[PDB]
């Protein structure tokens, strides 16, 4: 039942769109956020590169997590990309229930 | 020393509400600053509906002894019904930039 | 692999972001960076409510590296105190801790 926010990029809005609407059907997060118009920056294959991505954050429970990130990964385009969890300490009571009753 | 700092994470509708919401708490000193991000979506089922609104994030910076009062304060002043609001903590940071947040509260 | 964690940091600028970027993956203290353009920063500063638009950082390294991380943003970064702020990873992808960890 504690919550957790879970980072994510995708490689435009449209595939962060329904990757989003996929897990938030499946019930494996409550909610996520879209922040387009980012730009990511890392070494790969030797050449240090720079996409445009899209930032996600979806929130979901310790529960679901595990469950969460595997959905995630299969349908990304990417082989690997990121996926983080960082642990939230306290929240508004109202809303971690509303967000506990919709996974 | 330093109070343990923390980030809290909460979404407005619009530009406007989400600098009233800041100021509103940068001035009871519940929180030491914030950062508006506009351009966000957010998918969410609401009462068995999809719902895609377009949403300002919010990243405001405080301590742990404030984030209660912050988070109430928050709800108070939030148009939504049942708005964002999130803790994360911050196990480490640097040394100036932490007693800064401590000293503005 | 060393636990990872995530490092706010606010640039003034794009043209700062991306050098600072560049700059700490180069000396190997990150292995990923997350640039935020058009973000708007909200605070006091003796007596004005400030509001500079900046850009939004998200950096990703390990526990290991995060003091280094913090002491090379820092310098490298125009302004005398910046906001560098830490926090914990409590899981991920396996394949892709591995490789944040790998590239540190």
């Known amino acids: 039942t504690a919550v957790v926010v879970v980072l994510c990029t995708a490689p435009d809005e449209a595939t962060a769109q329904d990757l989003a609407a996929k897990v938030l059907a499946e019930k494996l997060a409550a909610?996520?956020?879209?922040?387009?118009?980012?730009?990511?920056?890392?070494?790969?294959?030797?050449?240090?590169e720079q996409e445009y991505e899209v930032q996600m954050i979806?929130?979901?429970?310790?529960?679901?997590?595990?469950?969460?990130?595997?959905?995630?990964?299969?349908?990304?385009?990417?082989?690997?990309?990121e996926l983080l969890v960082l642990p939230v300490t306290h929240g508004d009571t109202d809303y971690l229930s509303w967000l506990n009753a919709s996974l």
Do not use: M, R
């Not at 909610?31 to 240090?48: H, V």
């Open 31 to 48: 909610c996520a956020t879209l922040i387009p118009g980012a730009t990511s920056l890392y070494y790969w294959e030797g050449k240090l």
């Open 58 to 81: 979806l929130k979901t429970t310790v529960s679901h997590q595990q469950a969460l990130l595997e959905c995630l990964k299969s349908h990304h385009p990417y082989q690997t990309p």
